[PDB]
Design a protein around this ligand. Sequence first.
Ligand SMILES: Nc1nc2c(ncn2[C@@H]2O[C@H](COP(=O)(O)OP(=O)(O)CP(=O)(O)O)[C@@H](O)[C@H]2O)c(=O)[nH]1
Ligand SMILES: [Mg+2]
Length: 203
Amino acid sequence: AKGEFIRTKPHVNVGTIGHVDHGKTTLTAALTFVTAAENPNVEVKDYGDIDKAPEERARGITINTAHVEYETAKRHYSHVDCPGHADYIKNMITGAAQMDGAILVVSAADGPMPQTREHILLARQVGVPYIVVFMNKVDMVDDPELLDLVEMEVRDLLNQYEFPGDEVPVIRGSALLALEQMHRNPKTRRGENEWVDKIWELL
RNA sequence: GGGUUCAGAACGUCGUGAGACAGUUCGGUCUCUAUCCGCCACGGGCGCAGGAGGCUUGAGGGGGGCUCUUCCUAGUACGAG
Ligand SMILES: Nc1nc2c(ncn2[C@@H]2O[C@H](COP(=O)(O)OP(=O)(O)CP(=O)(O)O)[C@@H](O)[C@H]2O)c(=O)[nH]1
Ligand SMILES: [Mg+2]
């Protein structure tokens, strides 16, 4: 009652970094629910069990790199979910020392923060060729052209440590909402619900 | 009436002694009846510029005024955390 792994598509490890409280984990649980419906072989994880360690849970934050499995009819992924803060950097650095690609995560409301830097810096010294940004917390105050300033300065940061910043695919949206509807929408593909389609732009 | 503050008894101690010490130590009677002012209640009498059965206004008095936890705004202002 464990089942044999059926290697169909190719496997690639992608991790998720970025400062604290910026949606790193939820965005992670999201990719689980999102990519779920449109294909089996995923096994759903939630904001709760993604961070099953007491305190990590009861206390609020993420303390240990997760490790999630979700695919696409295109490519199979293994998602290593790093923690924000400092202190635990010794656990993100270990999560990072793996992941082929890093799904960077910045927040519209806050913008690139102190850890956002170092993480990127570690990625340039860990050996994570390729980064993808994902502005989260966008569903905040109508910023006609403010969230645009983020993608202007975040790219400045990436192209500040030898990263294709100007090329880096900066998706936009919210993970909470995206998650939320999915949370109460198990089965349901893309090209339908608002935000859910914002996750796929990233996937 | 547990402490002190009578009489008994003892310790230490001081005194030849009787005795002595806010030094200890055990014991050791706390008084049915409220006249007046005061107070809580309750009436009788006369008064209210005509006699009565009812229902009332409220000057002025009194009473009562308290506080904690948790959830939501929101893990949002602020904060590297
Ligand atoms: N407004 C808004 N809030 C969101 C969004 N995504 C997440 N959040 C908020 O952040 C909370 C937890 O975020 P989480 O994903 O764990 O943050 P994190 O990136 O893991 C921070 P660390 O890993 O360092 O502990 C959520 O319960 C929610 O209130 C979003 O897209 N918009
Ligand atoms: Mg986390």
